[PDB]
RNA sequence: UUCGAUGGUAGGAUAGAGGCCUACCAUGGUUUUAACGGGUAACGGGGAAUUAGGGUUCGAUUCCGGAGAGGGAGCCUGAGAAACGGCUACCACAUCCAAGGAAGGCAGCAGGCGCGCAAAUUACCCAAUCCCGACACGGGGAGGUAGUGACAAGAAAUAACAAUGCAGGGUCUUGUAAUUGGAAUGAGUACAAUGUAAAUACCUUAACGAGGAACAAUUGGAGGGCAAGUCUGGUGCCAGCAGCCGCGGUAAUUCCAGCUCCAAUAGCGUAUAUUAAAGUUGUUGCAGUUAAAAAGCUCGUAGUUGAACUUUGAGCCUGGUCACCGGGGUCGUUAACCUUCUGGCAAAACCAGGACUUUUACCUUGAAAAAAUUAGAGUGUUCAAAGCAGGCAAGUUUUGCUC
RNA sequence: GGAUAGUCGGGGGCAUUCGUAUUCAAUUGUCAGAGGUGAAAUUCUUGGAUUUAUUGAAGACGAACUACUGCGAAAGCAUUUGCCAAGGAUGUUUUCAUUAAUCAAGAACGAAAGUUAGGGGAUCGAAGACGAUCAGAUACCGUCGUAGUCUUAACCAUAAACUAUGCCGACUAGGGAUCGGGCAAUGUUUCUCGACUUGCUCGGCACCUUACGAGAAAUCAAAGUCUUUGGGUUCCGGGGGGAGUAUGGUCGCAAGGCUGAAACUUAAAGGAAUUGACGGAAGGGCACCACAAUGGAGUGGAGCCUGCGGCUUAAU
RNA sequence: AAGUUGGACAAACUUGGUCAUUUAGAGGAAGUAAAAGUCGUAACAAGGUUUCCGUAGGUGAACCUGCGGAAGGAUCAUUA
RNA sequence: AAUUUUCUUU
C-alpha cells in the first residue's frame, strides 16, 4: 500500500534470525566505528554507509558488531547532521521539481508530483517536530528550501 | 492497514474450519490472541497450537478438530457489565448452554460464565461456539 | 444486465482508445470494438490464370496479391454477415469456426 | 459501510439526524405542515358552509358521478371539496346548511376513484347523517 | 466589544461574592467537539403509552422546582413582595356622571358572552387533612360531600326447573315448542336500622313487586384480506358500494328491500395524533453493478481508527455452600507489601498502623440519597380495580395481647 | 518513508527528425464526359473536365506493426533523436523507526463541446444554401459551406468521466496464457552477450472450469468469509411524478457549475428471469387457397342468369 | 407641610435601519387529472437513420444535426 | 429506395 501510489510491492530485506556478530569476521567493533566516522567525514549518507560496508568490506549488519545503529554512532561521536537523511532527500527532490517547473511551467504532471512531495514533506516534518528531532518552530518554506538544502 | 490482529486470527480460523482443514497458520500473534486461544482450548474447541517465536510479532500454527461452528470478534470493545452479560449471551450465543463469550476482564481474559463466577465485568473480546 | 463480460470490446487496463472509421458507412468505431478481417486476395481471379499465363512475359513470374485490412462496425458487420448473431451459450466462444 | 469506532457516537448520531429527514413520516411530522398550510390544523372535524355542488367524474376504470359539494371553512377561510357518502342527500343539503367536515380515512389522501377530494361530510344542519335518512330526525326550518 | 464584550487595580451599591455599576489600564472570551442567529403549534422533571432486546412517541394536568396575575415600569409596608382579592403612571378595554368627577383586572371557587369538533352547579359544610390568628370556643370556594353526564378502571340484568311427540342418539339424554303450569325470581315500590356535619349512595329491612309488549340488545360485517349467502325481489357502468384489490352495460354471492348467519357486548363504528409491525432510519440491524443510491480523480487539516513487544507459571497454610469453586498471606525461580510519617527494637536494617493510581478511561462494591409511580413481600375491600391494614376470640366477655 | 543497482514504461514537458495521404497552385499529353447514387439529381467540362506526369505550398494525423498487450490518480498517452524532472515493480544481512489508513472545511488536474484576445485555417463539418425520396421531409442521401476541428495567453469543470462495482488490511479452488523484475540450468542457438526452452517467485492486465460461498436472478475469486448478522474509514438512498423544478446562497464575461425544496397528485413505478405473440432480425426448409413458365384457361371490357349493397314502395 | 433644584430606574409616543410571520394586486411564465379531439410517429424489433450520455445549434412538436464518450447493441469470435 | 394510423369494453 503505497502512500502516494497504487502499487502493492513487498520488496524489502529479510534480516536473518541470528542477531549475532558474524561467525567468520574480524570487524573489531571499534575499527568499524572509526571507519564509519572516516566515511562520514567523507560525506556520504548512512544508507550509503551501510551499502558500501555490506557490499565491499564484508560486514552484513553494522549493528551486529557495533552494538548500536550507525545513526546512533554518528550522534554519539558528534557527526550528526541537523536535518534527517530522509527529510533532506525529500526536500532536495522537491527543490529539483520546483526548479524543473520554474524552467518549464507546462509540466502539470510535475506540478502534481510536487504537490505529493510537499504533502509528504509536511507530514514527515510534523512527525519529526512531534517526536523532537526538529525544533517545534521548524516550518517549511519553498523560498528558503534551497538554502535549507545547501 | 491492520487494525486488530484478533479479528484476522479468528477469521482465518473460521475459514479453515469451514474448509475442513486440520491446521491453520496465524500471523501476526499477540498476547490477546494467545489468551483467547487458551480460553478456547480449556473449553475444548481448539487443539494444541505451537507459537513460532521469530524476532518479530511471531507466528503460530494451530491444530483444529472441527466441533466449532464460528469464532468471531466484537469490534469495538464494548463495555459489558454483569447485568449486560445475559443480554450479550442472548444476542450472540446459540443457546444458554452452548456458546462462550470472551471478556477481557480486569482479572484477565476469561469466559463469560467464569467472569460471572468471579463477579467482574469488562470489555467484550469475541465469541465461539 | 451485462450482455457481454468484456462489454463488447477489449478494454482492460486502458482509459481511452482511438476510434477508426468503418469502410462502408464511415462510422466512428473504437479500435478495440471494430471487427477486423484481412482480405488476402490474388490480384486476378483464379479463372484468368491461363489467360494471364498465355499473355505474360518474364518466364513464369510470380503473380502478386493484395492485402487489405477491413474494419467493420457492429451494424455493418451484421448486415454484411461477416459476424452473425449467436445463441447465449455460443456467445462465450472466441475460436473461429 | 458505516463507522464502528467506540468514539463515533457523534458521527452516527449526526448522520442519523441528517438521514431521518428523508423519511416521509418524519418529514410530515417535523415540518409542521398540519398547522402551516394544511386545511385542518390537526383537528378531527371542522364546521363550514356549503358553497356549491360539483359533479366530479370517476377515474378509470370506473365511470359515475361522485355527487360532491364545495364547503368554505369558517375558522380557516380555506375553500375545500367535500364528499357526500350516501345517495339522495344532495337534494336534502342546500346552500348554507352549516355542514361538518371530517377526514376520509386515508390520512389526507384521496380514497377510491374520486379525484382531488380529501374530506367527507358527517353532519348537516347540526343533526347528523343517517338520522334524517331513516326519517328519525327532521331538518330545522331555517 | 458603540452604550461591558474578556481580565487587573481602586471605589460605589447590595444582606452578601461578583464588570452589578463607575474611573483608569490591557484585548481579550466562545467556536466545525457546531460558537452565534433563527424556529419550536417547547414550562422542566418524577413519569406515561408500545414492549424480546435496542429503541420511538408523549408528559398543560393530583408530586417537586420556575414564571405570570391584561403588557410594561416604579415604590411603601413588612424578616420575607418589585405582592396586584398592596399602591402609583402610560398603553388597550368596561362602567355611574348631575358632564365637577369617580372608579378595575375571576390564567381562584360558581355562573355569562365569543372562539369553537371539543370539556359541569351562580349547591352544602368546616365533620375528617391541614392552615391562619390574641386562641379549646373563630375563619378557611384550601379541603370534604353531592347534582350532571356514555365511557376512565373493576363486578354483573335480559333468565330458568319439568310433562309433551317428532329428528334422533343409544333404556340415559340435546333441539324446533303459535302448549301449559306451579316454582327461584331481581329492577323497582314502599317502609325500619345503619351510614353521614346534614345528607345521597353502599351495606342492610320485613313486606308488595313477571306467565309473555312479561319489566323486545344493540353496533358493524357476510368476495379476498378477515368470520359469516351465487338466497328472493327493484335498477342496469346509472343510482351507487367500496380502508386496497375491486363489483355494477337485464341472472348483481360487493348497489337497495326481506330472511338468516358471523364478531364484540351495554357496548360498537367513524375522523385524527401516535406506537408495534418498519430489518421502510437499521449501534444492535438496512441498502448502493442492473430496483433509489461510490463524489471523474488526487492531495490534504479537524473527526474516526490505529502492528507486536515490559512478571508468566508451579508448591503451601488456614478458614468458607456444594470430586469441585471464590477469597488472604507467604517462601525459591527473580528481591519479594515499592516509598513516606509515627512507635519500638538497633548495625544501617526490621516489624506494626496511616497515606499510597504519575495519570485516566473501564469493571465491582459502598455512601448519601423525596414520595407517588414500576416490579414485587405480607394482608378475606363478599373476588377485583382497591386500601395499608389487620388478627386472637365462643366454652369465660375478660376494660389485653399481637403484629 | 528514504537511499542504492540493473531495468521497464504508446507516463509528463521542451527542442528536433521523418512518413504517405487530402486540398490547392503552375506546367505537359489524347479527348467527352467526370463526380455521385438504389435510381438519380445538383455542379463543371473540346475555353481541355477527369486521368496521367513533374515541382511546390498549407494545415491535420502518425495507417499497417496494434494484441482479451503497456503507462498514468483520472481525464488520457502511439513517427525518429536528444535533454530535464519524476514514477511503479524487482533485487538488497542498506537507512529511519510507527513516521500509519480514511476523510469535513480547503486545494491540483480534469475528454469533448462552449467563451475572451493573437496566429493559422488542408480535411471534415453545427447554422445555412441548393438537388433528389415522400402526401407533407423541416431529417436521414449528394455537393458546397460559417462557427468549430489546430495552437498560444486567460476561462469553466461536466460525460453511459463505467468495471454503472469507493480506499486500506487478513483468509479462501484447480489450470493455462501475457507484461515487468529476480533466481536456477556441467539447457539449445548466434559472428559472453543476446534470442529461444523449462521450473520457481513477486507485482499487474486479464482468461477457462467449478461453486465450499453469495445473490431475486442475470451473475460474482468478489458482488465470498452476513439471521452463524461487528477489521477500519469516507460518499450516498428511503415508493413514482412534481423536480434536479422554484426560491435562497455561492463561483463564472456568458453558457452554465455547486447546494437545493414545498404544495398537490398517484397504487404503482422499477429490476431479474420464464412462456407465448410480434420483428421491414438471422439461419434451415414447405406451399399453383405463393411466385416463376414465351406459362394454359380465364374474369373484370359487351349483353344477359343469379346473389349482395344502395334507391323506391306497402312489403320490396 | 405646600412648594424648589439635580441624579438614577424609567412606562409610553413620532421616526429610521434590521429580523420573523401573515396578507392584496393589473400582468406574466409552469406543473398536476382527464370513457371514446385536432397535428404526426420520437421510443419499445436492426421501431424501419441502433439506443443513451455530455455539450452546442436549429426547427410547430415529438425531435434533427455537429464533436467526444458508453453498450444498458444488433458483435463476447478471424491466431493466418 | 419506400412502407403513417389502428378510440374507449364484453
Ligand atoms: Zn459501418
Distance of CA D30 to the CA centre of its chain: 20
Torsion of CA C41, C44, C50, C55, to 10 degrees: -140
Interatomic CA distance for residues C76 and D68, integer angstroms: 63
- E strand or H helix that includes residue C75: helix C74-80
Interchain CB contact of A19 with B (< 8 Å): yes
Characterise D12 by phi-psi region: left (phi > 0), alpha (psi -120 to 50), beta (else).
Answer: alpha
For chain B, helix, strand, coil in percent to 5 are 35, 25, 40
Interatomic CA distance for residues D34 and D37, integer angstroms: 6
Question: What are the two backbone dihedrals, phi and then psi, of residue B74, each rounded to the nearest 5 degrees?
Answer: -120, 100
Which nucleotide is closest to D42, CA to C1'?
A: E272
Interatomic CA distance for residues D96 and A60, integer angstroms: 108
Report the helix count and the strand count for chain D, using DSSP H and E: 3, 5
Burial class of residue B116 (count of CB atoms within 10 Å of its CB; 0-12, 13-18, 19+): middle
Interatomic CA distance for residues A71 and A86, integer angstroms: 12
* DSSP annotation of B37: H
Residues 6+ apart with CB under 8 A from B70: B14, B128, B129
Q: Please, do chains B and C touch (3+ CB pairs < 8 Å)?
A: no
CA at C21, C1' at E150: how many angstroms apart? 89
Contact A113, A97 (CB under 8 A): yes
CA at C19, C1' at G51: how many angstroms apart? 19
Report the residue of D6, D8, D12 to disrupt the B interface, i.e. the one with the largest count of B CBs within 10 Å.
Answer: D6
How many angstroms is it from C69 CA to the middle of ligand 1? 14
The strand pairing partners of D81, in sequence order, are D70
A98: nearest Cα among A83, A113, A120, A119: A113
Interchain CB contact of A8 with B (< 8 Å): no
Query: Which chain F positions have some atom within 7 A of a protein CB?
Result: 1-4, 10-14, 62, 64-78, 84-101, 108-111, 153, 163-166, 168-173, 202-209, 212, 218-220, 223-226, 228-239, 262-267, 271-273, 281-283
Interatomic CA distance for residues C75 and A29, integer angstroms: 80
Q: Would you call B55 and A19 a contact, using CB atoms and an 8 Å cutoff? A: yes
DSSP characters over C2-30:
-S-TTTTS--SS-S---EEE-SSS--EEE
Interatomic CA distance for residues B118 and B107, integer angstroms: 9
CA angle A30, A34, A35 (to 5 degrees): 110
* DSSP annotation of D57: B
D133: nearest Cα among D69, D68, D95, D88: D88
Interatomic CA distance for residues A88 and A65, integer angstroms: 28
Burial class of residue C35 (count of CB atoms within 10 Å of its CB; 0-12, 13-18, 19+): middle
Q: Would you call A17 and B1 a contact, using CB atoms and an 8 Å cutoff? A: no
Query: Which chain G positions have some atom within 7 A of a protein CB?
Result: 22, 33-35, 46, 50, 68-80
User: CB closer than 7 A to strand H: which residues?
Assistant: D 60-61
This PDB structure is determined at a resolution in Å of 2.4
Q: Would you call B54 and A1 a contact, using CB atoms and an 8 Å cutoff? A: no
SS (H, E, C) chain A: CCCCCCCCCCCCCCCCCCCCCCCCCCCCCHHHHHHHHHHHHHCCCHHHHHHHHHHHHCCCCHHHHHCCCHHHHHHHHCCCCCCCHHHHHHHHHHHHHHHHHHHCCCCHHHHHHHHHHHHHHHHHHHHHHHHCCCCCCCCCCHHHHHHHHC
Interatomic CA distance for residues B110 and B94, integer angstroms: 19
How many angstroms is it from C42 CA to the middle of ligand 1? 25
Burial class of residue A45 (count of CB atoms within 10 Å of its CB; 0-12, 13-18, 19+): middle
Contacts of D5 in chain B (CB under 8 A): 76
Alpha carbon distances (Å) from B127 to C17, D6, D37, D101, D102 = 53, 19, 55, 61, 57
How close are the terminal C-alpha atoms of chain C, in Å?
A: 28
Residues 6+ apart with CB under 8 A from B99: B89, B92, B93, B127, B128, B129
Q: What grid cell was written down for B29?
A: 500473534
**How many CB atoms are located within 10 Å of the residue A85 CB?**
13
Residues 12-31 of B with CB under 7 A from strand F: 12, 14-16, 18-19
Per-residue b/e over C36-73, b at no fewer than 16 CB within 10 Å? Answer: eeeeeeeeeeeeeeeeeeeeeeeeeeeeeeeeeebbbb
Residues 6+ apart with CB under 8 A from A117: A90, A93, A94, A97
Per-residue b/e over A50-64, b at no fewer than 16 CB within 10 Å? Answer: beebeeeeebebbeb
How many angstroms is it from C75 CA to the middle of ligand 1? 6
Torsion of CA D66, D72, D73, D74, to 10 degrees: -150
Alpha helices (runs of H) in chain D, residue ranges in sequence order:
9-19, 24-30, 33-36
Amino acid at each position: 500500500g503505497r502512500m502516494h501510489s497504487k502499487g502493492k510491492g513487498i520488496a524489502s530485506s529479510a534480516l536473518p534470525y541470528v542477531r549475532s556478530p558474524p561467525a567468520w569476521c574480524k570487524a573489531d567493533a571499534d575499527s568499524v566505528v572509526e571507519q564509519i566516522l572516516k566515511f562520514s567525514k567523507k560525506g556520504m549518507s548512512p544508507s550509503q554507509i551501510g551499502v558500501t560496508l555490506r557490499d565491499s568490506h564484508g560486514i552484513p549488519q553494522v549493528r551486529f558488531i557495533t552494538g548500536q545503529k550507525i545513526m546512533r554512532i554518528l550522534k554519539a561521536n558528534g557527526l550528526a547532521p541537523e536535518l534527517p537523511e530522509d527529510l533532506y532527500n525529500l526536500i532536495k527532490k522537491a527543490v529539483s521539481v520546483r526548479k524543473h517547473l520554474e524552467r518549464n511551467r507546462k509540466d502539470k504532471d510535475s506540478k502534481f508530483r510536487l504537490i505529493l512531495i510537499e504533502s509528504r514533506i509536511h507530514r514527515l516534518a510534523r512527525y519529526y517536530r512531534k517526536v523532537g528531532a526538529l525544533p517545534p518552530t521548524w516550518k517549511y518554506e519553498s523560498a528558503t528550501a534551497s538554502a535549507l538544502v545547501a | 492497514v491492520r487494525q486488530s490482529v484478533l479479528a484476522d486470527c479468528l477469521n482465518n480460523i473460521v475459514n479453515a474450519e469451514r474448509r475442513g482443514r486440520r491446521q491453520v497458520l496465524i500471523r501476526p500473534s499477540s498476547k490477546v490472541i494467545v489468551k483467547f486461544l487458551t480460553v478456547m482450548q480449556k473449553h475444548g474447541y481448539i487443539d494444541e497450537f505451537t507459537e513460532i517465536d521469530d524476532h518479530r510479532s511471531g507466528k503460530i500454527v494451530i491444530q483444529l478438530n472441527g466441533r466449532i461452528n464460528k469464532c468471531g470478534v466484537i469490534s469495538p470493545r464494548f463495555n459489558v457489565k454483569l447485568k449486560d452479560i445475559e443480554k450479550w449471551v442472548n444476542q450472540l450465543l446459540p443457546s444458554r448452554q452452548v456458546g462462550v463469550i470472551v471478556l477481557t476482564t480486569s482479572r484477565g481474559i476469561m469466559s463469560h460464565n467464569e467472569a460471572r463466577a468471579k463477579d467482574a465485568g469488562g470489555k467484550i473480546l469475541g465469541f465461539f461456539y | 444486465t451485462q450482455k457481454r463480460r468484456n462489454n463488447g470490446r477489449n478494454k482492460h487496463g486502458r482509459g481511452h482508445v482511438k476510434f477508426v472509421r468503418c469502410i462502408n458507412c464511415s462510422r466512428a468505431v473504437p479500435k478495440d470494438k471494430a471487427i477486423k478481417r484481412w482480405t488476402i486476395r490474388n490480384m486476378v481471379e483464379t479463372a484468368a490464370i491461363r489467360d494471364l499465363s498465355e499473355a505474360s512475359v518474364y518466364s513464369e513470374y510470380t503473380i502478386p496479391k493484395l492485402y487489405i485490412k477491413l474494419q467493420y462496425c457492429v451494424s455493418c458487420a451484421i448486415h454484411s454477415r461477416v459476424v452473425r448473431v449467436r445463441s447465449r451459450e455460443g456467445r462465450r466462444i472466441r475460436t473461429p469456426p | 459501510g458505516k463507522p464502528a469506532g467506540l468514539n463515533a457516537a457523534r458521527k452516527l448520531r449526526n448522520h442519523r439526524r441528517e438521514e431521518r429527514w428523508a423519511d416521509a413520516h418524519y418529514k410530515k411530522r417535523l415540518l409542521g405542515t398540519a398547522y402551516k398550510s394544511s386545511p385542518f390544523g390537526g383537528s378531527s372535524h371542522a364546521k363550514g358552509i356549503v358553497v356549491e355542488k360539483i359533479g366530479v367524474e370517476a377515474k378509470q376504470p370506473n365511470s359515475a358521478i361522485r355527487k360532491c359539494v364545495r364547503v368554505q371553512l369558517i375558522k380557516n377561510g380555506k375553500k375545500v371539496t367535500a364528499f357526500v357518502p350516501h345517495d339522495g342527500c344532495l337534494n336534502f343539503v342546500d346552500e348554507n346548511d352549516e355542514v361538518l367536515l371530517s377526514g376520509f380515512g386515508r390520512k389526507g389522501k384521496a380514497k377510491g376513484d374520486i379525484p382531488g377530494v380529501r374530506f367527507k361530510v358527517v353532519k348537516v344542519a347540526g343533526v347528523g347523517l343517517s338520522a334524517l335518512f331513516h326519517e328519525k330526525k327532521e331538518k330545522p326550518r331555517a
